Write a protein that binds this ligand. Structure first.
Ligand SMILES: N=C(N)NC(=O)c1nc(-c2cncnc2)c(N2CCCCCC2)nc1N
Length: 245
C-alpha cells in the first residue's frame, strides 16, 4: 500500500495473509486474501500460478504483522487450491484473476470467528457502487514502488471507483481493462495498491453493508498518474464462486 495508514487486523478482520514454504524451509509472503466463509479464502490466481501445489502454502487469519505472530491468530494449510480455468496473462493485465483456497488446520478445523477474524459479504450479482465511491484496500504490499522490503505492519488506504469508460481511455489502460475488471485510484494518484497487495480486498459499503467488491489484481507502476489500480470485479464471478464453494 502506497500512502494510506497503518492499521491492525481488527479493522479488516476478513484479511488473510498467504505465505509459501520452501525449498529448504524458509517461509515467505505471497499475497493477500479475504475470508468469505469459515473454510474459504478468496484471492488472485496470479499469486499461485507459478507454484500451483496446495501443500506449499500457509494461510493466516487474525494476523496484523508480516513476520511476527499476532495474538489470537489462526494458521491453516490449504486443503484445496482452485485457480480460474480461463485465467490468462497479458503483459500487465491478468484476465479472470481469481482463486479460492479451502483452509484447514493441523486439527482439521476451519476459521472460528473472533474480534480479529470475521467473514466479509460478497456483493449481490452485477451490483457495484457508482463511480466516485470511496472504497478501502488492505495489504502488506510495498510502501513505495522502489522498496525492496514489505512493511512489517498491515496497511490500508482509500481509493475511488473509476468508470469502465474512463479507465478504457488509452491515456489510462486502453483495451487492457475489461468489464470483469474494476479500476480505482486516488484523485491525486497519491495512494494505491502495489506489489504484495495482490489478492487482497477492495471493500465498499453497499446497501449499508461492507462488501467484497474487488480483489487486487494489477496495475502499471503504483500510484502513477493515469494508471489506476485494477481489481477483479467480484460481482461478475458469483456463479464461479458459488459452484466452487
Ligand atoms: N495498483 C497498482 N498500481 N498496482 C498494483 O496493484 C500492482 N502493481 C505491481 C507493480 C507495478 N509496477 C512495478 N512493480 C510492481 C504488481 N506486480 C507486478 C510485477 C510482477 C507481478 C506482481 C507484482 N502487482 C500489483 N498488484
Amino acid at each position: 500500500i502506497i500512502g494510506g495508514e497503518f492499521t491492525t487486523i481488527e479493522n479488516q478482520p476478513w484479511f488473510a495473509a498467504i505465505y509459501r514454504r520452501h525449498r529448504g524451509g524458509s517461509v515467505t509472503y505471497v499475497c493477500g486474501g479475504s475470508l468469505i466463509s469459515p473454510c474459504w479464502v478468496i484471492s488472485a490466481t496470479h499469486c499461485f500460478i507459478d507454484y500451483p501445489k496446495k501443500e506449499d502454502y500457509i494461510v493466516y487469519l487474525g494476523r496484523s504483522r508480516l513476520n511476527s505472530n499476532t495474538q489470537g491468530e489462526m494458521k491453516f494449510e490449504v486443503e484445496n487450491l482452485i485457480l480460474h480455468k480461463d485465467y490468462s496473462a497479458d503483459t500487465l493485465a491478468h484476465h479472470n484473476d481469481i482463486a479460492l483456497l479451502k483452509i484447514r488446520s493441523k486439527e482439521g478445523r476451519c476459521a472460528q470467528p473472533s474480534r480479529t477474524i470475521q467473514t466479509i459479504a460478497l456483493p449481490s450479482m452485477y451490483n457495484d457502487p457508482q463511480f466516485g465511491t470511496s472504497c478501502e484496500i488492505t495489504g502488506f504490499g510495498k510502501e513505495q514502488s522502489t522498496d525492496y522490503l514489505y512493511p512489517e505492519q498491515l496497511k490500508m488506504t482509500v481509493v475511488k471507483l473509476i468508470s469502465h469508460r474512463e479507465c478504457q481511455q488509452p491515456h489510462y489502460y486502453g483495451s487492457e481493462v475489461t468489464t470483469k475488471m474494476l479500476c480505482a485510484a486516488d484523485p491525486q494518484w497519491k495512494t494505491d495498491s502495489c506489489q504484495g497487495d495482490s489478492g487482497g480486498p477492495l471493500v465498499c459499503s453497499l446497501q449499508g453493508r461492507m462488501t467484497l467488491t474487488g480483489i487486487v489484481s494489477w496495475g502499471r507502476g503504483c500510484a502513477l498518474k493515469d494508471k489506476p489500480g485494477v481489481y477483479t470485479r467480484v460481482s461478475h464471478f458469483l456463479p464461479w464462486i458459488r459452484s466452487h464453494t
